[PDB]
Design a protein around this ligand. Structure first.
Ligand SMILES: Cc1cn([C@H]2C[C@H](O)[C@@H](COP(=O)(O)OP(=O)(O)OP(=O)(O)O)O2)c(=O)[nH]c1=O
Ligand SMILES: [Ca+2]
Ligand SMILES: [Ca+2]
Ligand SMILES: [Ca+2]
Length: 341
DNA sequence: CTAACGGGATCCTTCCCCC
DNA sequence: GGGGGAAGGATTC
């Protein structure tokens, strides 16, 4: 297998840069305002000019303005970014029928049937980089290797407008030397669990007893990491089908009053049913983010599709159950639909 | 009515009903 | 012993 992985660079900020090129060279920060107060919210992404000084995704807006008070702070316009993303994905489909769209800005291409070695796969990587910046003037990063995981690691390394190949021989040195926290699927809770077991490299998973590795990170992550360490990972590129659609809004103030929460729950349903855009769900989940950011959720499924009116009636019953069974004030209320037809 | 913070989605684990 | 569905967890974007 030769897998080609395309990852658009600083993508929300770069799209705003494309629609308004005067922004180029300046630090651009794309924020998600929450409306509790002024500048309440977080950073969706920033470009590298803003990232240089520590303004990156996740940190509060007010924190970013303390660091770069004169940066360009734009509100998030995600469906603008989605239509741009949709057009770029359609470009990628010319280079392989086997393609996996992983998120709004990442696609995996199986180029096994289109090139014979890495040298050609590298050249076609440049052909894709040019065509995207040709047709849409967006710089991307190409990562090429033998499986999805190392193709993504390659792109992580060359990330800002790069292209880089991890060959079979670098895969082996990476198995021995790459920090295991830098492996896709290993966040900090799992990474911290691995270090307390002594594992800091992928090869260490072969030396440890499986049951004690399984006992602390789970069966799936264990087989996953062992498979990578044995150089025997090879999940195929598959078309990913969106399995849920939802929306959760922050209330202007915390509450446990059913009548105060109901408008927000209903607006989540309105916006959620719009995003379904045709497509009928048979399962609904009411999702509450509590006082202290803890997410509670009650749902239920039906032998049939759910109309908007049933979504209204049932969300109230499911919301009542959340307050019946939890004592925390709710801070954000939302809804998720799944199990489509 | 301005208060130390978004939002969307996936896969997996755990528990419990059930064959 | 396992298949299945609900709610919680960890991840990533
Ligand atoms: C990391 C991250 C990204 N995003 C959004 C913003 C990005 O435009 C999009 C893809 O994110 P990423 O690909 O993870 O980051 P990026 O594209 O903005 O920067 P990079 O060049 O390093 O890839 O997802 C979030 O909303 N929250 C997050 O925590
Ligand atoms: Ca990415
Ligand atoms: Ca990206
Ligand atoms: Ca990590």
């Amino acid at each position: 297998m030769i897998v080609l992985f395309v990852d658009f660079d600083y993508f929300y900020a770069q799209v705003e840069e494309v629609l308004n090129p005067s922004l180029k060279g300046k630090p651009v920060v794309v924020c998600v305002f929450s409306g509790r107060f002024e500048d309440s919210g977080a950073v969706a992404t920033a470009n590298y000019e803003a990232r240089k000084f520590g303004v990156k995704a996740g940190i509060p807006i007010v924190e970013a303005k303390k660091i770069l008070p004169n940066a360009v702070y734009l509100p998030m316009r995600k469906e603008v970014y989605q239509q741009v993303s949709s057009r770029i994905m359609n470009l990628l489909r010319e280079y392989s029928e086997k393609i996996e769209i992983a998120s709004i800005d990442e696609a995996y291409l199986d180029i096994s049937d289109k090139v014979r070695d890495y040298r050609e796969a590298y050249n076609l990587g440049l052909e894709i980089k040019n065509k995207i910046l040709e047709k849409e003037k967006i710089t991307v990063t190409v990562g090429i290797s033998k499986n999805k995981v190392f193709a993504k690691i390659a792109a992580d390394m060359a990330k800002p407008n790069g292209i880089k190949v991890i060959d079979d021989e670098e895969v082996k040195r990476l198995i021995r030397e790459l920090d295991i926290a830098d492996v896709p699927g290993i966040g900090n809770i799992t990474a911290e669990k691995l270090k307390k077991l002594g594992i800091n490299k992928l090869v260490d998973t072969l030396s440890i007893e499986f049951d004690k590795l399984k006992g602390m990170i789970g069966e799936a992550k264990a087989k996953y990491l062992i498979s990578l360490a044995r150089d025997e990972y090879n999940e195929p590129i598959r078309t990913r089908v969106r399995k849920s659609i939802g929306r959760i809004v922050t209330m202007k103030r915390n509450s446990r009053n059913l009548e105060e929460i109901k408008p927000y729950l209903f607006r989540a349903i309105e916006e959620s049913y719009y995003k379904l855009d045709k497509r009928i769900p048979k399962a609904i989940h009411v999702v509450a983010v509590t006082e202290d950011l803890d997410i509670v959720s009650r749902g239920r499924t039906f032998p049939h599709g759910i109309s908007k009116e049933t979504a209204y009636s049932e969300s109230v019953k499911l919301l009542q159950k959340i307050l019946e069974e939890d004592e925390r004030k709710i801070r954000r209320i939302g809804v998720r639909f799944s199990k489509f037809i």
